[PDB]
Amino acid sequence: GEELFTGVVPILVELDGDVNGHKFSVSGEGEGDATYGKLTLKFICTTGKLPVPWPTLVTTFLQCFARYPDHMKQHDFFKSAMPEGYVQERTIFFKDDGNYKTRAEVKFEGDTLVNRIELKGIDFKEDGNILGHKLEYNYNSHNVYIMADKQKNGIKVNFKIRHNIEDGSVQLADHYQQNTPIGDGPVLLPDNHYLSTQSALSKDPNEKRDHMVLLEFVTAAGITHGMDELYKAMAKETAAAK
Amino acid sequence: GEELFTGVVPILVELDGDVNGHKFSVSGEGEGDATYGKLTLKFICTTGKLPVPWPTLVTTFLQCFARYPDHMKQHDFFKSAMPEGYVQERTIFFKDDGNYKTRAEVKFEGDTLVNRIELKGIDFKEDGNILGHKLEYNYNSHNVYIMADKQKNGIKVNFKIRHNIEDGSVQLADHYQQNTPIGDGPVLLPDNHYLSTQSALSKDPNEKRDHMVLLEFVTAAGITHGMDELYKAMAKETAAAK
Amino acid sequence: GEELFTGVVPILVELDGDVNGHKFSVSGEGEGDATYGKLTLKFICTTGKLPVPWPTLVTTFLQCFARYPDHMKQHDFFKSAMPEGYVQERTIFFKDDGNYKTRAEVKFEGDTLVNRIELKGIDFKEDGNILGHKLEYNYNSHNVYIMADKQKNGIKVNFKIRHNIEDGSVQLADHYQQNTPIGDGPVLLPDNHYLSTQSALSKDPNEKRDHMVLLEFVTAAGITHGMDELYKAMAKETAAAK
Amino acid sequence: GEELFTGVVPILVELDGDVNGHKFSVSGEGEGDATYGKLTLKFICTTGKLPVPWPTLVTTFLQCFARYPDHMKQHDFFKSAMPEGYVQERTIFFKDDGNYKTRAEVKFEGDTLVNRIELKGIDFKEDGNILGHKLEYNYNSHNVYIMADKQKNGIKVNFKIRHNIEDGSVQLADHYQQNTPIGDGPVLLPDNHYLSTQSALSKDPNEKRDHMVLLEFVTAAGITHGMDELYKAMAKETAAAK
Amino acid sequence: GEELFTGVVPILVELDGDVNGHKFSVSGEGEGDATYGKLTLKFICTTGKLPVPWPTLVTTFLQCFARYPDHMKQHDFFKSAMPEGYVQERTIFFKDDGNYKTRAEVKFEGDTLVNRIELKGIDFKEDGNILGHKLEYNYNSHNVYIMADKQKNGIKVNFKIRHNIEDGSVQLADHYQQNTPIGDGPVLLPDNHYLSTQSALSKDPNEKRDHMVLLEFVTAAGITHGMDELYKAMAKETAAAK
Amino acid sequence: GEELFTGVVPILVELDGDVNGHKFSVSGEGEGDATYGKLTLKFICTTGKLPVPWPTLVTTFLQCFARYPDHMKQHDFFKSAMPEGYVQERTIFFKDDGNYKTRAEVKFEGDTLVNRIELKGIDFKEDGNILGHKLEYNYNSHNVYIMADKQKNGIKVNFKIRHNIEDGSVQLADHYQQNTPIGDGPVLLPDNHYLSTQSALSKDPNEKRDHMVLLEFVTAAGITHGMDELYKAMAKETAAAK
Structure with a gap:
């Protein structure tokens, strides 16, 4: 599970798409550092020019690299499925426009x-x-x-x-x-x-192919550490120590 | 610089140590509130038991979270180096004992x-x-x-x-x-x-791992605001107003 | 309680306001000397120009620094709530005008x-x-x-x-x-x-930001020391001693 | 060249050996997926029992299936020689023992x-x-x-x-x-x-012949992508965007 | 059976044809390497010019030379009939045209x-x-x-x-x-x-007779090796070994 | 020449021998199919029992029936001498024994x-x-x-x-x-x-006379067809066609 993510992990992304009959493919490479919730990636459209904007594909192109606080580790589904992995499916509705299914x-x-x-x-x-x-x-x-x-x-x-x-x-x-x-x-x-x-x-100034350089930070949150009472008690004690 | 510290900042601390051949690692997490000079942190020895007392590592385990008075803001090196950051190096001499280099x-x-x-x-x-x-x-x-x-x-x-x-x-x-x-x-x-x-x-009563809960307040001082003359003049004026 | 105020205490004031849709923020710093009932403070509007007169905010911007006579110490609620502190709420009615709620x-x-x-x-x-x-x-x-x-x-x-x-x-x-x-x-x-x-x-002649320098003395009163009879008796005795 | 390796390629391995006069032959089959640097192979000693340990023959038994990062593609000799191919020769010295020449x-x-x-x-x-x-x-x-x-x-x-x-x-x-x-x-x-x-x-539990099942992943590395400066600049920009 | 095909086998092909009354004969020679599923052949029309296109006769002109994967050997009818051999009969329907019976x-x-x-x-x-x-x-x-x-x-x-x-x-x-x-x-x-x-x-640039040079690779497929579960288990184990 | 051998040719063999004074005669009959390099023959000792082993006479008892590959036809002396034919003379040395002259x-x-x-x-x-x-x-x-x-x-x-x-x-x-x-x-x-x-x-189980049944296949070889370069070029082209 999570022991597979302690260091820098090389990443490979492969996509085949069809949007309104416009067919394309993308290859991506990078590194993921789950200790910092950090992703460094570079994507290349291997079929020519991408028929959709690069930002529309960002969420489709690695939640197993999110930084989960120590107190939230028991809630990290993504790493727990590793190495066998997981299937990730989506429907993305573009308001007043089309949809992507992935x-x-x-x-x-x-x-x-x-x-x-x-x-x-x-x-x-x-x-x-x-x-x-x-x-x-x-x-x-x-x-x-x-x-x-x-x-x-x-x-x-x-x-x-x-x-x-x-x-x-x-x-x-x-x-x-x-x-x-x-x-x-x-x-x-x-x-x-x-x-x-x-x-x-x-963009990579040396890259002439249609591409996207992406830097992403992902952090889990929303579950209490429950230490508020402990820190409050520690603050009371300091006043008696000065 | 200082605009990166106006609110609550999540903190991550990672240490690898070797003291007289006793190797260990520590992971720490918390929050820093530079407006109050406040740090709330919890450290875990991830390799087992710490071979040194927890207090000996406190200074090694975030001076960019110090509260700098408004009149001293131009002297806050720590935040001015952000986001790129700074290298912090120390030699710590324990009197009649060993030394740590960090x-x-x-x-x-x-x-x-x-x-x-x-x-x-x-x-x-x-x-x-x-x-x-x-x-x-x-x-x-x-x-x-x-x-x-x-x-x-x-x-x-x-x-x-x-x-x-x-x-x-x-x-x-x-x-x-x-x-x-x-x-x-x-x-x-x-x-x-x-x-x-x-x-x-x-200590966290629910934590069974070797750890330290730390609450720290840090305030810059030692540079005059130069307003002593102004307040003295204001005190003279009050006597003429009563 | 009161033992936290025996010397000079650094003060920090933070305000966020909205008056008729005019939003603003203020940061304040100073020192409080409860032994003299003395407050020395300087406030800065951090959002630009203050949309209300500085004097209208004086009472909003530290009654725990009041000087309580020794015979009235048992009536000092403000310090007794320290270090945990207190919530201070107000409605301020400006006659023939608006109101502030704080x-x-x-x-x-x-x-x-x-x-x-x-x-x-x-x-x-x-x-x-x-x-x-x-x-x-x-x-x-x-x-x-x-x-x-x-x-x-x-x-x-x-x-x-x-x-x-x-x-x-x-x-x-x-x-x-x-x-x-x-x-x-x-x-x-x-x-x-x-x-x-x-x-x-x-005003601080060196300060170019919109600000207010404030000096304030606050003293508790209105409760008898009950020593009038003792001093009267001491005055009677002096006449017999001359 | 590299266009011959974009999908799953069937593999055939044939070896004739003689080690200290002990003659043997091996047939191997599998698949290579150069996009993942993955090899799945099964080898059979066709002459009876192998006179050497199976692990001693692993390196002898497909570097054209290595995964070369996009930024290193110009350094992939192995695929560039395809379809005509290449001759691969070795001397393997077993420390304090014999040698294999292949x-x-x-x-x-x-x-x-x-x-x-x-x-x-x-x-x-x-x-x-x-x-x-x-x-x-x-x-x-x-x-x-x-x-x-x-x-x-x-x-x-x-x-x-x-x-x-x-x-x-x-x-x-x-x-x-x-x-x-x-x-x-x-x-x-x-x-x-x-x-x-x-x-x-x-081992294949259904196979009664002397054999070896081998799974191998091979990745090229050691040449910079030279994007460190670009990602550092992107990290600086994010701080100004929050 | 299959032991007759372990090396390079010389091949001889002889055909007598009659297509809509157009009579012709063909002699062919080559080599078959069943270990690689490889056929190298050269056919000569011995009666003069061929009255049909050479490609129409390719399937008529050696399935005993197909490469059968080790796991599929029990399904190789063609070699199992050797040396006595087999009769191979066909009807070939050319859409919107004639038929060949062979x-x-x-x-x-x-x-x-x-x-x-x-x-x-x-x-x-x-x-x-x-x-x-x-x-x-x-x-x-x-x-x-x-x-x-x-x-x-x-x-x-x-x-x-x-x-x-x-x-x-x-x-x-x-x-x-x-x-x-x-x-x-x-x-x-x-x-x-x-x-x-x-x-x-x-075509052979030195050959002046009506002829066809043919290179053909034939591989059996479509029957599972049933090793998918074994390789998946081996991939799980590697993650625990790193 | 070679046109006399396109089909099945009946064969007659007649021998008169004298080995160390042991006189004998042999009559042989069969068929030769030069298209397959095939000979089917049956020999009878007409004088009684053969005084030498039947295998010693095999080479003496039809090289005009060898299969010459198409690319080697210009090197088939045996058929080129037909119908007039050829004289075939030999000395056969049996190691540590006698000799036959034929x-x-x-x-x-x-x-x-x-x-x-x-x-x-x-x-x-x-x-x-x-x-x-x-x-x-x-x-x-x-x-x-x-x-x-x-x-x-x-x-x-x-x-x-x-x-x-x-x-x-x-x-x-x-x-x-x-x-x-x-x-x-x-x-x-x-x-x-x-x-x-x-x-x-x-042996013919129905034959009671001293005899030998012989099946022989003879193929010319050792002269290049010179098509190695052509087939190599055809293999290069296939890779560009897939």
């Missing part, structure tokens, strides 16, 4: 953590913010709400992504997600909590 | 302030106050003397820690310290001043 | 006495003495009437502030106040008494 | 990647760890050091294999290796780098 | 594997793709579906050949096939499986 | 290929492997080395026959041979090559 298998292949995805996008507007490439090349910080789904020995996940539109408006992308273990062994079914995520997007 | 990198990893340390301790007495675990589980209040070191675009720091020995005596630990920025940008080189520090140590 | 938590954070406030002001006249900045930059001396409120293990406080208007008239501000302990321990529930207060306001 | 031709035969080997072993001790079958049925993880050999339009390779001995000791096997292209076309002459290799050995 | 005896004549065929073609269009020589001089890769026919102690075989037409279209040739042993001994009756075939056609 | 005329008599021989054997040991009948009733496979002899418009032939002795040892019979045309027309003078020969000996 299925990914996240697992170890030796020392490499692999994220293998298939993406299907339908009902997009050819002149909308996605197919029309009207989204800024940036990313907002979000909270990812996790709950146990004991019927599927997994988790149900929900959140709203806000993509900045070039005109100053916002393109909402409502995420519905479920993760189920690939293996038959025990997994950690969590209490309700969330992951706080921050992401930066950039 | 090297830490204090910096941001996303929203998390991280303190990554390596500790080397030699020449300790196997039956002394440290290796013999003769130190009380408490901590005294101290002043930490800071001066600029313009040759290294950093600071030189010196102070004496007084560790209470179980027999009522005192184990002195003389600290020599230097901090240098990780980045190449400007930093605040301070005038001579000090930090006043108070610390309380406790 | 909630502050006054408590120790290590050696620092902190006053953390939230201020809400509504129904002000955009052209009145407050929003129109028609108040002189000065302050009158007042009496603050205290009574026990045993139902809330606290005190109820009432007084009238007279703010001088630039045209020579007076802007009355009727204060209704309640203080309740943060902790569950015993507190001193007082007999009816009052605090006599005097305040001087000034 | 010559293999690795090339495509239609869709099948074939490894055809001849092995000659001399100077072995009849009672040593090899001829005496004193080696554990397991395998350690190693680094394989590669350098260009421009005189032979090939590569020179060196590494040390550590074979665990049943008594807890180690049987060292020093590998000297050279690979030269079979064809006359251009090949990729690499900068110095290494391959990180991990291997698991098992 | 009868071949494939058997050993000493060390030589001989394929002796008689071909009868009727109902061809004199201006169609066959008699009109409108087929490209190339060949696609196909799957050949095999099933046991226990009533005839043989196999039934079916597949579709796609011949490229010079105008970019496709000439389909639906193959129906049966193979029966010449001898009375036991043969291997297979479970359903297929052969994957790839073929290249060329 | 002269045969091989030619057509209508549709029948006739081999008329005279055999003279001297210096045999009455108790040796030949006169003592110590040779097994079997035959090994051999290579027959052919070279042109332009001085005699013929060929010189040499090879070693290994006859198995009943005790497990070997009786070597070194063959020296020359063939010269009977006619004056052109013949094919070959480049150095060899014939690969395999022979099986049996």
Whole structure:
């Protein structure tokens, strides 16, 4: 489980997509440091130009690298499914636009953590913010709400992504997600909590292929450590010590 | 710089140590509130039992969380080096005993302030106050003397820690310290001043691992606000107003 | 309790306000000497220009620093709630104008006495003495009437502030106040008494930010020492000694 | 070149050996997935019982299936020689024991990647760890050091294999290796780098012949992506975005 | 059976054909290497010019040379009938055109594997793709579906050949096939499986006779090795070994 | 020439021999199929019992029936001398024993290929492997080395026959041979090559006369087809076609 993430883990991401008949593929590589909740990744569209904005694919392109506070370790489903891994499925609704449906298998292949995805996008507007490439090349910080789904020995996940539109408006992308273990062994079914995520997007000035450089920090939160009473008592004692 | 510390900052501390061949590791987590100069932390020895007393590691285990009075803000080197951070190095001489040499990198990893340390301790007495675990589980209040070191675009720091020995005596630990920025940008080189520090140590009754709960308040002082003349003049005026 | 105030205590004041939609923040620092009932403070509007006159915020911006005569020490609720502190709530009615509602938590954070406030002001006249900045930059001396409120293990406080208007008239501000302990321990529930207060306001000629320098003396009074008979008897005896 | 390895490639291995006059043959089959650096193989001794331990033959029994990071693709000699292939020659010195000399031709035969080997072993001790079958049925993880050999339009390779001995000791096997292209076309002459290799050995419970089931992961590393400065700059920018 | 195919086997092919009254003969020679599933052949029309395109005769002109994976050896009917051999009969329907009916005896004549065929073609269009020589001089890769026919102690075989037409279209040739042993001994009756075939056609620049140079690779597939569970278990174990 | 051998040719063999004064005659009949290099023959000793082992006479008792690969047809001297035929002369040295000298005329008599021989054997040991009948009733496979002899418009032939002795040892019979045309027309003078020969000996269970049933396959080899470069180029092209 979590002992597989104590150091720097190499990452490989592979995606095949089809959005309104526009077929494409993406290869990604990087490193994940779960002790810091840190991800450093670079994605390449291997089929030519990407037919959708790079930011629309960020959530599709590694929650097993989230930093879980020590007091929340028993709620880390993602690592508990390793090395066999988990299936991560989503429906992403772009408000007043199309939807993406995704299925990914996240697992170890030796020392490499692999994220293998298939993406299907339908009902997009050819002149909308996605197919029309009207989204800024940036990313907002979000909270990812996790709950146990004991019927599927997994988790149900929900959140709203806000993509900045070039005109100053916002393109909402409502995420519905479920993760189920690939293996038959025990997994950690969590209490309700969330992951706080921050992401930066950039370009490699030496890269001529269509690509995205991504830096992401992911931290679990929302479950009390229950030490408030202890620290309050320690503050009372200091006053008697001065 | 200082704008990164206006609210509550999550903290992560990681230490690898070797004291007279006794190897150990420690993980720490908490929160820092620089507006109040407040630190709430909990440390866990992840390798088993700590081979040294917990109080001997307090100064090694976040001066960027000190409360700097408004009139002293231009002297806060620690925050000025952020987010790139600083290297903090020490030699700690335990009187009539061994020494610790430490090297830490204090910096941001996303929203998390991280303190990554390596500790080397030699020449300790196997039956002394440290290796013999003769130190009380408490901590005294101290002043930490800071001066600029313009040759290294950093600071030189010196102070004496007084560790209470179980027999009522005192184990002195003389600290020599230097901090240098990780980045190449400007930093605040301070005038001579000090930090006043108070610390309380406790145990989590629910924690069965070897650990330390620490509450610490740190305040900068020693530089005049130069308002003595103004307040004296205001006191003269009140007498004429009654 | 009172043993935490025997010397000079550093003070920190933090306020967030909203008056008729005009949002602002203030940071304050100083020292309190409860042996003399003395407060020396400097406040800075950190958001830009203050949308209300500085004198309107004086009572909102430390009654735990009042000088209580030795014979009245058993009536000092404010210090008795320390270090855990107290919640101080007010409604301030500006005659023929708006009102401020305030909630502050006054408590120790290590050696620092902190006053953390939230201020809400509504129904002000955009052209009145407050929003129109028609108040002189000065302050009158007042009496603050205290009574026990045993139902809330606290005190109820009432007084009238007279703010001088630039045209020579007076802007009355009727204060209704309640203080309740943060902790569950015993507190001193007082007999009816009052605090006599005097305040001087000034500017720091070196400060370019919008700010207020404040000097304030606060003394408890209104409860007999009951020594009138003893001194009268001593005066009778002197006549027989000459 | 590398386009011949994008999917799952069937593998065939054929070996004829003679070790101190003990003649034997081995047939092997499997699949190679160069995208994951993964090899799944099963070897059968077709002449009867193998006269040497199965682990001693692991390195002799497909470096064209290594996973080369995108930023290191120009250094993948092995695939660049395909389909014509390469000759792989070795001398393997077993410390305090005999040596193996090997010559293999690795090339495509239609869709099948074939490894055809001849092995000659001399100077072995009849009672040593090899001829005496004193080696554990397991395998350690190693680094394989590669350098260009421009005189032979090939590569020179060196590494040390550590074979665990049943008594807890180690049987060292020093590998000297050279690979030269079979064809006359251009090949990729690499900068110095290494391959990180991990291997698991098992038995097929249904197989009654003398055999070895092998799972192996091979990843190229040791050449910088040069993106450290870019990610550092992206981390600086995030601090200004929060 | 299969022991007759361990090395390189010389091949002789003899055909007599009649297509719509156009009589011709063909002699072929080559080598078969069943260990690699490889065939190298050269065919000569001995009567003059061939009245049909060379690609239309490829399937008529050695399935005993297919590479059968070790785990599928018990399903190799073709070699099991050797040396006595088998009769191979077909009806080939050229869509919107004529049909070929073939009868071949494939058997050993000493060390030589001989394929002796008689071909009868009727109902061809004199201006169609066959008699009109409108087929490209190339060949696609196909799957050949095999099933046991226990009533005839043989196999039934079916597949579709796609011949490229010079105008970019496709000439389909639906193959129906049966193979029966010449001898009375036991043969291997297979479970359903297929052969994957790839073929290249060329000309000998020194040959002035009407001819075809053919290179063909044939591999059996479609039956599980059942080792998926074993390799998955080996991957789990590696994670516990790192 | 070669057009006289395209189908099945009836064969007649006639021998008169004298070995150490032991006179005998043999009549043989069969069929030769030069397309397969196949000979089916039955020999009868017409004078009574043969005074030498049947295997010693196999090479004396039809090289015009060898299968010459298409690329080697210009090197087939034997058929090129037909129908007039050739004289075939030998000296056969039986190691540590006697010698046979033979002269045969091989030619057509209508549709029948006739081999008329005279055999003279001297210096045999009455108790040796030949006169003592110590040779097994079997035959090994051999290579027959052919070279042109332009001085005699013929060929010189040499090879070693290994006859198995009943005790497990070997009786070597070194063959020296020359063939010269009977006619004056052109013949094919070959480049150095060899014939690969395999022979099986049996008895007719219905035959009561002293006899030998012989099945023999003879194939020319040792001259390159020179198509290695063409097939290598075809293999390169397939990789670009998949």
